[PDB]
């Protein structure tokens, strides 16, 4: 799930549609 | 659906129940 933002000091960029991150936010599958 | 949290200052702690920041407010499923 997720999909709003997050990162924990960078990361993300939406994963270009694909999500990313983990503990610090992002999302995708979850 | 707004989850009961805004996300101007800080990301959504309600990410723990699947909410995410959209247009300054934490939402899930509209």
Residue numbers in the entry:
A (entry chain B), B (entry chain A): 1 to 30
What's in the article?
Cyclotides are a large family of topologically unique peptides characterized by a head-to-tail cyclic backbone and three interlocked disulfide bonds. This combination of structural features forms a cyclic cystine knot (CCK) motif and confers cyclotides exceptional stability. Cyclotides are divided into three subfamilies: bracelet, Möbius, and trypsin inhibitor subfamilies. Since cyclotides were first reported two decades ago, studies on bracelet cyclotides have been hampered by their low synthetic yields because of poor oxidative folding efficiency.
Therefore, d-enantiomers of [I11L]cyO2 and [I11L]hD were chemically synthesized and used for quasi-racemic crystallization to determine structures of cyO2 and hyen D. The mirror-image symmetry of d-[I11L]cyO2 with l-cyO2 and d-[I11L]hD with l-hyen D was confirmed using circular dichroism (CD). The crystal structure of the quasi-racemate of wild-type cyO2 was solved in space group P1 21 1 at 1.17 Å resolution. The structure of cyO2 displays a small α-helix centered in loop 3 and a triple-strand β-sheet located in loops 4, 5, and 6. The inset of Figure 3b shows the disulfide connectivity of cyO2 is well defined by the electron density and confirms it forms the cystine knot topology, the structure of which is key to the ultrastability of cyclotides. Overall, the structure of cyO2 determined here using crystallography is similar to the solution structure previously determined by NMR spectroscopy, validating the quasi-racemic crystallography approach for structure elucidation of bracelet cyclotides. To gain more insight into the differences between bracelet and Möbius cyclotides and why they might have different folding yields, the crystal structures of cyO2 and kB1 were compared. Between the two peptides, the hydrogen bond network exhibited differences. Specifically, kB1 has more hydrogen bonds between different loops. We note, in particular, the hydrogen bond between Val-10 (loop 2) and Trp-23 (loop 5), for which an equivalent hydrogen bond to connect loop 2 to 5 is not present in cyO2.
